[PDB]
């Protein structure tokens, strides 16, 4: 039965071209591409890590940002465990759109869901909109953990997924007495 | 809604490997419940004068006892496990319910506080 103890299934949602895919690739086979493919639908990836004494193979889902595949993505959040919600820190939309996904989140997934706000493309200083003290806020008005990084530039990315699997792993260990 | 030309080509063949990956997922937690059922099947006592487990009497026969806290039946230290944290007055568990706990969290069983059924075919 392979060699692994749980298995973490996670999404990453958020608004078209604020960079899901990209952090995937990065964190996954650490690749980047300045091209821009926008997914179709869903679509995932599979990596096991060791942490916490233990094996965890994590299924790492990428969804399609676009209100166009809505109805489709959001059918696969109730097998979710943890979510990473990501805007572009160079785009006040996506990052207007955050409370909306919350929404979105607590609609169609279950209760111990943990949830981490990610502000992408902290390397773009230079075209940076969204300030780190008002991502910071919204997160601490959500109730969820805060980072801010960069797929392009492998920034504050493993550390991302890495706080979400350990955050989970207390949600589990809370689960019981 | 929308239409949608070959995109659910495109679509089915991830539904299609994820679902492989369901059924491999059932194989791997079905070995642990029943193997976990067949540990039941062996209860011998009744947790109350015998230890449940094996069903050795409890008391003044030498055999020294705790309750477990998580079926709340009498269990003798040699079927026991004293679990222990960061706290004093450790909790103790039966052989079983410490395989249980070992179950509700290798099978993810312990989100959904049971185990849940993600039917998600693919549109033709
Ligand atoms: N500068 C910079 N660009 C990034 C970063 N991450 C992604 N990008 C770029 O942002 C654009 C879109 O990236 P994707 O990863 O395709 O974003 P997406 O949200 O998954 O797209 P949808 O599937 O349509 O939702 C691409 O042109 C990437 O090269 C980052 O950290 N920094
Ligand atoms: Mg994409
Ligand atoms: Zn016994
Ligand atoms: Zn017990």
């Not at chain 2, 029943?34 to 449940?52: F, H, P, Q, S, W």
Request: aromatic share 10%; charged share 30%.
């Amino acid at each position: 039965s392979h060699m692994f103890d749980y298995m973490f299934k996670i999404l990453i949602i958020g608004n078209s071209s604020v960079g899901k895919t990209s952090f995937l690739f990065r964190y996954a086979d650490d690749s980047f591409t300045p091209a821009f493919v926008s997914t179709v639908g869903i679509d995932f990836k599979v990596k096991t890590i060791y942490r916490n004494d233990k094996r965890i193979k994590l299924q790492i889902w990428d969804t399609a940002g676009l209100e166009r595949y809505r109805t489709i993505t959001t059918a696969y959040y109730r097998g979710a465990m943890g979510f990473i919600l990501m805007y572009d820190i160079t785009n006040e939309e996506s990052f207007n759109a955050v409370q909306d996904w919350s929404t979105q989140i607590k609609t169609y997934s279950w209760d111990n869901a943990q949830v981490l706000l990610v502000g992408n493309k902290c390397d773009m200083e230079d075209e940076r909109v969204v300030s780190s003290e008002r991502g910071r806020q919204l997160a601490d008005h959500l109730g969820f953990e805060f980072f801010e990084a960069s797929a392009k530039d492998n920034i504050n990315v493993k550390q991302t997924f890495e706080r979400l699997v350990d955050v989970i792993c207390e949600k589990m260990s809370e689960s019981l007495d | 809604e929308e239409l949608t030309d070959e995109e659910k080509e495109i679509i089915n063949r991830v539904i299609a490997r994820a679902e492989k990956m369901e059924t491999m997922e059932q194989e791997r937690i079905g070995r642990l419940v029943d193997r976990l059922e067949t540990m039941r099947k062996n209860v011998a006592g009744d947790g109350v004068n015998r230890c449940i487990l094996c069903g050795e009497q409890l008391g003044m026969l030498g055999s020294a006892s705790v309750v477990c806290e998580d079926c709340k039946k009498n269990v003798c230290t040699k079927c026991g496990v004293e679990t222990s944290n960061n706290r004093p007055h450790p909790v103790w568990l039966c052989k079983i319910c410490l395989e249980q706990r070992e179950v509700w969290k290798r099978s993810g069983a312990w989100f959904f506080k049971g185990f849940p059924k993600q039917v998600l075919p693919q549109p033709m």
